[PDB]
Write an enzyme that holds these catalytic residues in place. Structure first.
Site, mmCIF file in Angstrom:
data_model
loop_
_atom_site.group_PDB
_atom_site.id
_atom_site.type_symbol
_atom_site.label_atom_id
_atom_site.label_comp_id
_atom_site.label_asym_id
_atom_site.label_seq_id
_atom_site.Cartn_x
_atom_site.Cartn_y
_atom_site.Cartn_z
ATOM 1 N N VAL A 59 0.818 -1.219 0.000
ATOM 2 C CA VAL A 59 0.000 0.000 0.000
ATOM 3 C C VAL A 59 0.849 1.266 0.000
ATOM 4 O O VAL A 59 0.579 2.234 -0.724
ATOM 5 C CB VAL A 59 -0.927 0.055 1.228
ATOM 6 C CG1 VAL A 59 -1.915 1.207 1.105
ATOM 7 C CG2 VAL A 59 -1.645 -1.260 1.407
ATOM 8 N N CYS A 60 1.878 1.233 0.839
ATOM 9 C CA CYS A 60 2.792 2.346 1.036
ATOM 10 C C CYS A 60 3.437 2.932 -0.239
ATOM 11 O O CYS A 60 3.647 4.151 -0.297
ATOM 12 C CB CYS A 60 3.894 1.914 1.998
ATOM 13 S SG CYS A 60 3.315 0.782 3.249
ATOM 14 N N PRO A 61 3.784 2.086 -1.241
ATOM 15 C CA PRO A 61 4.356 2.681 -2.458
ATOM 16 C C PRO A 61 3.591 3.898 -2.971
ATOM 17 O O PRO A 61 4.215 4.941 -3.147
ATOM 18 C CB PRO A 61 4.291 1.533 -3.467
ATOM 19 C CG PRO A 61 4.536 0.335 -2.640
ATOM 20 C CD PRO A 61 3.873 0.611 -1.286
ATOM 21 N N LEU A 73 3.832 7.117 -0.513
ATOM 22 C CA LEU A 73 5.161 7.707 -0.568
ATOM 23 C C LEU A 73 5.404 8.376 -1.919
ATOM 24 O O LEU A 73 6.018 9.448 -1.997
ATOM 25 C CB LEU A 73 6.222 6.640 -0.303
ATOM 26 C CG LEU A 73 6.056 5.917 1.036
ATOM 27 C CD1 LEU A 73 6.942 4.683 1.133
ATOM 28 C CD2 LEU A 73 6.362 6.872 2.166
#
Ligand SMILES: [Cl-]
Ligand SMILES: [Cl-]
Ligand SMILES: [Cl-]
Ligand SMILES: [Cl-]
Ligand SMILES: [Cl-]
Ligand SMILES: [Cl-]
Ligand SMILES: [Cl-]
Ligand SMILES: [Cl-]
Ligand SMILES: [Cl-]
Ligand SMILES: [Cl-]
Ligand SMILES: [K+]
Ligand SMILES: [K+]
Ligand SMILES: [K+]
Ligand SMILES: [K+]
Ligand SMILES: [K+]
Ligand SMILES: [K+]
Lengths: 167, 171, 167, 164, 166, 164, 166, 167, 167, 171
Positions: free
Chosen positions: I45-47, I50
Site C-alpha cells: 500500500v505504502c508505495p 510515498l
C-alpha cells in the site's frame, strides 16, 4: 492513661510462699487484682512499699483482691530476695518475674533505656477493667491504706451503679 | 556466627570487687576480653562455670585477659549473689548487668521468649575482633580449662601471623 | 547463635568410603549428628582436625553419633583429598560437598568474602535441635576430645531431664 | 505512663477568681504545679473533689504549689459554674478551659469516645517534670490530703536526693 | 549475551607454574585474554579441553594472548589437580580459583543450583571487550584450534578496522 | 460544600425544655430539620441568634420543621445556660451537646484551632438531604426570617418540582 | 548464558522457499533446531554466513535438524533479499522476521540501542533445550562445518546418555 | 466549610460589559468581592438570582464590592447569553468563564459528575478571607438584599473590632 | 492526540538520494517538517502514498517544507527498496530507519504487537510544535494533496496571527 | 494514537433536532460513527466545519453513518447556538455536551489547561474500532469532503478484507 481499658493476656513465672507458680490473665478473671510494679529487687526504696502492701494483704484477700508485685527480675531473684530481706519475707502474695518485659509493656510501664518498670500501681476489676492508677517517682512512697480506700470505693460503685461516692 | 567480627559499642553497669562501675567498649580496647554470658543469677549450672572461671582468673590476668560475665539481671542482683554464694564470692572480675538486653543482643545472644542470655562465651582480641565462640545448651556447663587453651592459641596466632595452631594446644 | 534451633532441610553430595552418596536432613532425623565445618580441602590446618574426629569416630558411632564434615568444595575434591592425604585417608564418615553454600548458609557459617565455611562445629540431637556450637578463628584448631565430652553431656541431659552437667 | 517526662508547651484561657487569664507552660516554670483534670462542669454529681482541693489551696500556695483544674469546657462555662455553685465558688485557683482538647492530649488524658478528660491528677516539679500521677474511674474520688502528702514527699526528695 | 561488552573488575587467587599468584582485571589490560570456564576439578570431561588448550598455549602466547581457566574450586585444589593428572600437569597458564563465584557471575556463567560454572569460553580484546563467546553443554567439548581461528579473526578486524572476516 | 448530600448517622445528648433526651438521625427521618451551630454557651455576646430562632419556632413547628442548636458544649452546660439567660430560657427546641465534635465534623463545621463549631445553619429535608447552607464569620448575624423564607421555598419545590 | 535452558514460545512470520509461513515453538518440538541470528538484511557480512550454512543445509536436514535464520527485519524484506542476492537466493530454510524483537529477546540477543540481533547461533534439542551457543562480534563470521560438528556431538551425547565427547 | 479561609490564586477569562477581560486573585486584593456561582448558562433559574444582583450592583460598587458570577461555561457563552436574555443583559459585572473548573474547585464547589458548579455564594474581604457563605438547592432563590445586609455587617465588624452586631 | 505538543529529540540513520545520512531534531529546527509514518518496506500500500508525497515534494521544498518518511525498517532496507521499486525510486527526501522504534514511540505511533508504525502523518512547524495529525487504518491510503492543503493553511495562520482558515 | 482501538463507554446529554436526549456507547453499536470534536460553542472556525458536515449529513445517513459533534459546552448551550446561528441551525445530527470532559478524555482529546476539546475527528466502525483520526490546530478547519472519502474507504476495506484502498479514493 490506661484507665478504663481491659488488661492484656500475659504468662509469667512467679514466686509465692516458697513455691514457684505460673500466672496468666485467666487467673485474674472474676477477681479483683492489684498489679504492683517496681524497678528492681535488692534496692532500698521498694521494700517498705511492698511491705506495706504485705501488711494489708489479709485485708485485701478478705475483699477478694489478689496482689501481684512485678519487676523485670526473675522469679529466682524474687525467691532470693524473699530469703534475705526481713521486710520482703513477710510477702505472701505472688511476686511475678518479668524478664522479657512483656507484662510491663502490656501496662505501658517500661523505662526502655533502663529495662526496669516504673513505680506504677494498677487496680483491675473482675472483668479485666483498670479502675485506678497510681504512678510516683522514687521517694514519693505509695501508701497501701490509700490503695485500700480506692479499692473499697471501686468495689462499691461496681455494686451500686447509678450511685457514686466522690472525694 | 559472629566469628571474625568487631564487637559493638555498649555501656552497662557492673559489680566488681565490692563496687559498682560502668563498663563500655572503650574499656576493652587494647586488651583481650572474655564475654561470658549466662541465663540467670541464683540458678544452678551457672555458679560452677563462673567459679571455674574465677579459679583461672589470676592466670588470665597475667595473659592480659579481662573477663566480663553477663546476664540480664541487674548489677544489684550480682552484688547480692556474690554475697550469698560461696562460689560466686570468689569472683574478682566484673559482673555486668544487662537488664535492657542491649549488650546481649549485640552478641546476638538473647533467648527472646525468655529475656535471658544463652550460655555463650566470646573471646575478643585487643583490636575488638571475635576470635573464638562457644555456645552450649541449658544443661551443658563450660570448661574453663579449654577456654584458656583457646585464648593462648589466639594470642599465639596473633604473635606469629606466619604460622598456625592445629588441634589441641600445648605450649 | 543458632543454639537450640532446629536445622534446616538440605540436600548434598558427599564422599564416604570410596563411594558417592546423597545426604539430606532426613538422614539426620532420629540420630545425633555433628556438622564439622572447615574452610577448604588441600589446606594446612584442617587435616589434623578432621583426623582427630576420625580417631574418635568409632566411639562416636558406638554412641549413635553421626559425623558430617562440610566444606564448600565438591565431593570430587573430597574424594581426591581422601586419596592424597594419609590423614584424610582415615576418614570413614561422610565428607559433604557444599559448593552452592546452601548448607553452610543454613548454619549461618559462610565467609561471604571468601566463599569458604568458617571453622564451626555443630552438635544436633535426634529432634534436629542444635545443642552445642564451637567456632574458632582461622589459625585455631579444635579439640576432638572436648567435642566428645560435650556430646556425652548433651546425651546425658537428654536422658535425665531433671538433671544437668557442669564441666 | 508519663511519669518522669517533661510537660509540653500549652496555651489556654482560664477563669481565675473574677477574671480571664491566659496560661502557658512558661507560667509553670520555677514552680510546683498540680494539673487536676475532670470530665465536665455543671454535672449532677456534687463536685466534692474540686472543693476538697480548694480547701487545701491555702496550704498548697504556702508550699509554693499552684493548682490548675482542667476540663474540655470553655473558660466561659467555668465562670458560669463558679457563679452558680456554692462549692465551685470557693475555688481561687485557675480553672483552665480546654475545648480543643490539646492540653488534655498533652497529658494523654482524653476519653476519645466522650470528648472529656479522665479523672487524672499530675504533680509537676519546677523543671516541668511529672513526679506523680493519679487516675481513677468515674465514681472513685480523689483525696486532696493524699495529694498533699505526695507533694510534700516530692518536695522532700527534691531537696534531699538519695536520702533513704 | 555479553557479546561486545566490557569485562567487570575482579580479584582472584590462581595457580600457575608452581607458584600462587593474584589475578585482577588490571592484568588483562593491554592484552588479549581467554577466560575458559569449566564446572569442577577432578572430573572426567574437563581435562582434555584444558589440555587441548594447553597444547596451543605457546602459540597463543606469541599472539599476545593470556589464558585464564576458571572454576569455582580453590586455587589450592587446582594445584593438587596439577600434580595428580598427567593431562592437567601440562598446563602452563593461570588456573584461577573462584570459590565466591564472583568472577563466574561477572560472566553471567554460574549454574546457580550447582555452584559450578558452565562450559563457556570468552575472548577479550585489550580494551576489555568480549569479542567471541562459546558455550556448550556438560557433554560437548571445545576445540582449541577453533578458538585459535576465532582469535586470529578477532585480531584482524581490530588491526584492520572497517573490514570484516567470514 | 455539603449541599445535596445526605446527613450522616449521629447520636447525641441534648437539653430540651426541662429534660435530657438522646437525639439520633432516626429522629430526623420524615421531618424537616434545622441544624443550627454556634461556637459557645455563656459568652459575652448577647445570643440574639438563638432567641431569634426561638421567636420563629412556633411557626417552624407549624411547618413540620424541627430545630436543633448545636455546640461543642455538653448538654449539662445547655441546661445551665437555659436556666440563667432570659434569652436562652425561651428556647423550646432541643439544644444538642457535641463534646466529641463528631456531629460537628459530620457537617464539616469544626474550627479546628478552637474546638468550636462555626456559625453554620443547615436545612435538611425529610429524606435527610441538605437543601440549604448558611455560614457566617463571628460578628455577622444570622436572620431567622431569611431562614424561614428559605425553608418555605425548599418545601415548595419539594412539593412542586420543576415549576419555574 | 542461556545454555541448558528451555526455549520460550514464539510466533513469527517467515519466508521459506517462495512462500510465507508461520513458525511457532510447536514446530521445533521433536526436532533439532538451529536458531541463527544476524543483525540486518541487505548488509555485507551476513550473507556468506547464511550461504555457508545453506551449503550444509541438505546435510543438516538428513540429521533431522531444522534451521531458522532470524533478524529484526520483516519476512517481507527477507523475500526481497532472496531475489536480489545470488548468495541469499540459495537459502532453502526458513528466514524468520522478528520486527517486534520478541524472538530475539527470548534468546536475550538484542542490541537494545540498535534494534538488531547479535551474531549468535543456538542449537536446540527436540526437548527444547539449548545445547550449544556461539556468539561473535560484527566482524567475525561463523563457520558452518564447525556448527555441524557441534551438532553431531550434541546428538551423540543424547543418543548415548551418560557419556561425553571432546 | 471554607469560612474564614483565604481564597486561592486563579486566572480566568470573563465577559464584562461588551469586553473580554482577564481576572486573577490580584484583582481582588484590597477589595470586597462576591463570587456568585451557578450551574449553567441558558437555564431558567439562575437569571433572576443573577438579575437581582444586577439590580443591587450600583449599591455594591458604592460599597466597594466587586461581583464575579462564575459558571463552568466559557466567557464566549456568557457574551451570547448576555445578548439574548433581557435579564442577563442588565448584568454589568464580570461574568467569569471556568471551563477547566479550577476556580470552581478552588471553592470546593464542583458537582464532579456533572461538571457544573453548585449554587454557592462567597463573600470575600480585602485580605482574601471568606466571611460569608450561602449555598442553596435549585428553586430556593438567593436573595440579593440579604446578601447586601451580610456585606454591610461584614464591613462593619472589619471597621469596628471588639464590637459586633448579631442577629 | 499529540496536537500542539513539541517533538522529542531523536537520532536516526536515513537513506536520502543514494547516500546514508544522520537525522536529528536539530535538522528540523527552524523548518517545517512532515513525518510520514508507514508500516513496512516491500509491502503493498505504502508505495503509492510515498510516491504521491514525492510528486509534491518540489512544491513542498519551495514552501520550505522538509519530508521525513519513517518505518521501523533499516536504512539498508530503504536503500534496497529505492532500487527495486520505480515508485520508491522517485523519492528524493530522507527515508529514515527506526529499528529501535524510538522515533516511532516519540510520536506514540507504534503497533506494539507488530513492531511496525501505524499510518500517521505529522506536520511540525519551525518551533517543533505539531500542527496537524492524520492517522488511518491499514487499508486506507492518504491523499498527498489534502496534506499539502493543510500545510498551506498552517503556514498561513503562522503568518497571520489574528486570522484563521476553514476548508 | 488511538487508531485501531475500541471506543470507551460513555453517557452524555445532547441536543438533536429540537430535543434533548441521552447518548451512550450502546447507541453506536452496529453503526458507523463520527465523533467530531470542537473547542467551544459561539466561536469562529467551528461553525464552518460543523455546517460543512451538515451539508454532507444526508449523504452520510445513507451510508449508515451517524454523526455526533462534541464540545465541553452543555447541551443547553448547543440548543441556543442552534437557535441563533444560521449555520448551526442546519445541523440535524446530535450535538453532545461534555461538561465533565469524560467523553473528550475517552478520546484523549482534552486541552487540560483550557477545558476544551481539540479539533479531532474520529471514524468508528460498527464493531467500535477507530478507523481514521484527524486532528488539526486551532486555526485549521477540516474538510467534510475528504472526511466522506475516508469513510467510504473504510467501509470498502470492511466489505472486502481481501484488498486495499491506496491514496485518494474513487468509487
Ligand atoms: Cl497508664
Ligand atoms: Cl555467633
Ligand atoms: Cl551460630
Ligand atoms: Cl500517664
Ligand atoms: Cl554471554
Ligand atoms: Cl458545607
Ligand atoms: Cl546465552
Ligand atoms: Cl464551603
Ligand atoms: Cl497523536
Ligand atoms: Cl489519538
Ligand atoms: K532482668
Ligand atoms: K568450590
Ligand atoms: K469542647
Ligand atoms: K468539649
Ligand atoms: K526492523
Ligand atoms: K463547560
Amino acid at each position: 492513661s490506661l484507665i478504663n481499658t481491659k488488661i492484656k493476656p500475659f504468662k509469667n513465672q512467679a514466686f509465692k510462699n516458697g513455691e514457684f507458680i505460673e500466672v496468666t490473665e485467666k487467673d485474674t478473671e472474676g477477681r479483683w487484682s492489684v498489679f504492683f510494679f517496681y524497678p528492681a529487687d535488692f534496692t532500698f526504696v521498694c521494700p517498705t512499699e511492698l511491705g506495706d502492701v504485705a501488711d494489708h494483704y489479709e485485708e485485701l484477700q478478705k475483699l477478694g483482691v489478689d496482689v501481684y508485685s512485678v519487676s523485670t527480675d526473675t522469679h529466682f531473684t524474687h525467691k532470693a530476695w524473699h530469703s534475705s530481706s526481713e521486710t520482703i519475707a513477710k510477702i505472701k502474695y505472688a511476686m511475678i518475674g518479668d524478664p522479657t518485659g512483656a507484662l510491663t509493656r502490656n501496662f505501658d510501664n517500661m523505662r526502655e533505656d533502663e529495662g526496669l518498670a516504673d513505680r506504677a500501681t494498677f487496680v483491675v476489676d473482675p472483668q479485666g477493667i483498670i479502675q485506678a492508677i497510681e504512678v510516683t517517682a522514687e521517694g514519693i512512697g505509695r501508701d497501701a491504706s490509700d490503695l485500700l480506700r480506692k479499692i473499697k470505693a471501686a468495689q462499691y460503685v461496681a455494686a451500686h451503679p447509678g450511685e457514686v461516692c466522690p472525694a
